[PDB]
Amino acid sequence: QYYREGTGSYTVVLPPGAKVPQAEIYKTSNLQGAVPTNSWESSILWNQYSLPIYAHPLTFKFKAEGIEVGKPALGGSGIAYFGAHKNDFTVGHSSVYTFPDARADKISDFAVDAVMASGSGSIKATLMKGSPYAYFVFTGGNPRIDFSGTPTVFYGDSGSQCLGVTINGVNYGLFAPSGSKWQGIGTGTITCILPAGKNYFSIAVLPDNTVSTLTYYKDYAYCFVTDTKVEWSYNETESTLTTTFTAEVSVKEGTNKGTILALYPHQWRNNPHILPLPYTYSTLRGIMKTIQGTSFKTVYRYHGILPNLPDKGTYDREALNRYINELALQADAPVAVDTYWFGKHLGKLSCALPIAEQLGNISAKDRFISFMKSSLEDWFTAKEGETAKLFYYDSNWGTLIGYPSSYGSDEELNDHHFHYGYFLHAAAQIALRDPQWASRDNWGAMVELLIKDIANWDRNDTRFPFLRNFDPYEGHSWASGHAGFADGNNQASSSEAINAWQAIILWGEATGNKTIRDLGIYLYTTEVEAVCNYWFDLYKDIFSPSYGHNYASMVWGGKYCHEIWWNGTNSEKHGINFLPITAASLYLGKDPNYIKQNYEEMLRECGTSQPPNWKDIQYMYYALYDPAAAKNMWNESIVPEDGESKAHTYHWICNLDSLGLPDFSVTADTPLYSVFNKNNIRTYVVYNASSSAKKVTFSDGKVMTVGPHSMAVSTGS
């Protein structure tokens, strides 16, 4: 049947030939509502056991015997750097040597509980991103710790409560209940003889082999993490985005209450709200610092986005208008009609629409808006017997899938944020112009279902899991639905994730929905912060000296590398983390010197003096360092990348030529703004999406009054 949402609808009738994710979900009866996907723990759900689980600092893998535990040995040189999962020891069971599967029982914002059970025993494991601990509860027998070789025992004996061990050069604590004994010390398998009535057991990866360190880790070893939560707040007055991270602990014994949290660089860098412990871990993501506590916060400065750049460029206006007319002839001509390529086309129209309006090209404006609306209205309606341009709800997993699908959006739940971000961008641009169309009673209900599929914010709405594609702790998104790879989950295009997030900001502000807007600000701001570290390494302290590049195109749980999914040029390899370039893409230019370094690396790698291909994308990027040079190199012979247009490319470059480069040293008390700086002259741009005039104040003292539903630009003091 069919479910009405405002004036649109989705279906639960699968079109003929259409494919869905697998029927089998390796979950327990405790995991209710829509099933989380697109994360680091996801392979537990899709595979009988799991693929490697990249929590950090620890990694894991489920198998018939139990749970492999390890700390990756970092290495590699050149095109990739590796932190592969390896087995330092397997947490097995004294009487159950073969478990039939591993099933997810509970998934929180940065942890997972999984259960392995036979009729005669079980292990329940809690794996946590940002913890040096892993926590276990046994039934039917004892922990049987099967080491990869024989460990060195640096502390403890058969009668001690804990052991300090070293295996593969990695120090661990093994923490048993008071009253436990240990059998098999000196062999490759140590069994923890649990006392009657106590069945909890934990391990930690330690930063050293001192007894003092082991004592500190023992102090918190019995504070088992039972829930993890993020919360966020956008402060409009201060232009900041605050995120709180909270772990709930259940104290299994002792009088200590707390835990040790490990923080990635995007969390600890320049963070005045923490007092790190001495302990660090060297990980694939850089140095993880540690803190004592069950909560911490991060606070980032938000620098605004715009719905478009203003009409301030040094372009030949008649040529720009002609480019708009050239695009208008192709307004109804997507290169392909699956969700992804249809999206790319909708993004192209979304970026050209305001340029047509600025020029007074009503014919082209009308062609663009008409196609955007008619196509969204088609996609957002599932007609009986329709096989293309519709959304289907899978109620096994709990996901909205558009048909026709592509690149595993259907069977693998890949990439929904990438695909749907383009649809959301188009919807937002319509909403800024037409509050009637975007209302919940009209097309806004279906729009918000796409938002919920990729980024549901409401933990009580069980139709979609909480924040599907975004990983709150790594601070970025994940592309694979299942993470069914040795190297875990992956994301290549961070810029396509950010496109979805900027679109959510615009939608929320256009519709007056502060919850959705602030969700967008949270996602956007945090992903940008992660991107600046793990993709661009702006601070020059993430990437190994042995890694041969200043840029990683793909980030995995277990590696990062300068590769892409097809045999493209090095221009393509760099460009996938720029496109789509929108008026939310100024973050790419946080460090103009990095723009220069990144572009020059790309040229060296191509063996050319200009980009061999994707020259439009590359010159838009280079314009964040030298717009005059980018304008000079640009020309009409360039065949646009399929999601781009000559009009939008040249409007971008020529506006930066006039306005200057983005200036991140100034903020404002409004959500839609940007500041530009040309040779120390600032230009301030604001968009007011509300129905009342706004007074906008910048941190340097600039004040602008901006009328309802308008863009304003002011240069100088």
**Contact footprint for Mg ion (CB under 5 A):** 26, 44, 47, 102, 146-147, 188, 540, 634-635
Binding of Na ion at residue 218 (CB under 5 A)? no
The token pair at 452 is 């919920």
Which does residue 162 bind out of Cl ion, Na ion, Ca ion, none, counting CB within 5 to 8 angstroms by kind?
Answer: Cl ion
Residue pair 408/28 in contact (Cβ under 8 Å)? The answer is no
Binding of Ni ion at residue 632 (CB under 5 A)? no
Count CA within 13 A, CB hemisphere, residue 384: 1
Binding of Na ion at residue 606 (CB under 5 A)? yes
Give the binding range for Ni ion (CB under 5 A) out of 31-39, 260-268, 633-641, 665-673: 633-641
Binding of Ca ion at residue 479 (CB under 5 A)? no
Residue pointed to by tokens 């893409």: 585
Binding of Ni ion at residue 316 (CB under 5 A)? no
**Other CB atoms closer than 10 Å to residue 545's CB: what's the count?**
7
The token pair at 179 is 């009253």
Binding of Cl ion at residue 582 (CB under 5 A)? no
Which does residue 26 bind out of Ca ion, Cl ion, Mg ion, none, counting CB within 5 to 8 angstroms by kind?
Answer: Mg ion
Residue number with the smallest Cβ distance to Ni ion: 635
Q: Which of residues 661-680 bind Ca ion (CB under 5 A)?
A: none
**Other CB atoms closer than 10 Å to residue 17's CB: what's the count?**
8
**Of the two residues 73 and 319, which places its CB atom closer to Mg ion in the complex?**
319
Which does residue 645 bind out of Mg ion, Na ion, Ca ion, none, counting CB within 5 to 8 angstroms by kind?
Answer: Na ion
Binding flags for Na ion, 568-587, as an x/- string (CB under 5 A): -xx-----------------
Query: What DSSP line would sit under 57-97, residue for residue?
Result: B-EEEEETTEEEEE----B--BSEEE-----SEEEEESS--
Euclidean distance between CA atoms 505 and 524, whole angstroms = 8
Q: What b-and-e string marks burial along 326-341, b requiring 16 or more CB atoms within 10 Å of the CB?
A: ebbeebeebeeebbbb
Q: Which of residues 540-579 bind Ni ion (CB under 5 A)?
A: 549, 551
- Least distance to Ni ion from the beta carbon of 11, Å? 44
Euclidean distance between CA atoms 107 and 27, whole angstroms = 10
Binding flags for Ni ion, 498-537, as an x/- string (CB under 5 A): ----------------------------------------
**Of the two residues 332 and 378, which places its CB atom closer to Ca ion in the complex?**
378
Q: Out of 227, 231, 411, 601, name the contact with Ni ion by CB under 5 A.
A: 601
Euclidean distance between CA atoms 17 and 399, whole angstroms = 18
**Of the two residues 378 and 605, which places its CB atom closer to Cl ion in the complex?**
378
Q: Which of residues 367-406 bind Cl ion (CB under 5 A)?
A: 378, 381, 383
Give the binding range for Na ion (CB under 5 A) out of 49-57, 388-396, 415-423, 632-640: 632-640
Q: Out of 632, 636, 693, 695, name the contact with Ni ion by CB under 5 A.
A: 636
- What distance lies between CA 373 and its chain's CA centroid? 29
Residue number with the smallest Cβ distance to Mg ion: 188
Beta strands in 530-659 (DSSP E): 554-556, 559-561
- Strand (E) or helix (H) holding 448: helix 445-455
**Of the two residues 491 and 569, which places its CB atom closer to Ca ion in the complex?**
491
Give me the amino acid identity at 403: Y
Which does residue 10 bind out of Na ion, Mg ion, Cl ion, none, counting CB within 5 to 8 angstroms by kind?
Answer: none
What SS3 class is residue 296?
strand
- Least distance to Na ion from the beta carbon of 575, Å? 12
- Strand (E) or helix (H) holding 111: strand 111-118
Which does residue 326 bind out of Ca ion, Cl ion, Ni ion, none, counting CB within 5 to 8 angstroms by kind?
Answer: none
| Residue 608, C-beta contacts closer than 8 angstroms, at least 6 positions apart | none
**Of the two residues 257 and 383, which places its CB atom closer to Cl ion in the complex?**
383
Binding of Na ion at residue 433 (CB under 5 A)? no
Euclidean distance between CA atoms 712 and 691, whole angstroms = 15
Beta 80-82 vs 181-183: how paired, if at all? Answer: unpaired
- What residues line the site for Cl ion (CB under 5 A)? 160-162, 253, 378, 381, 383
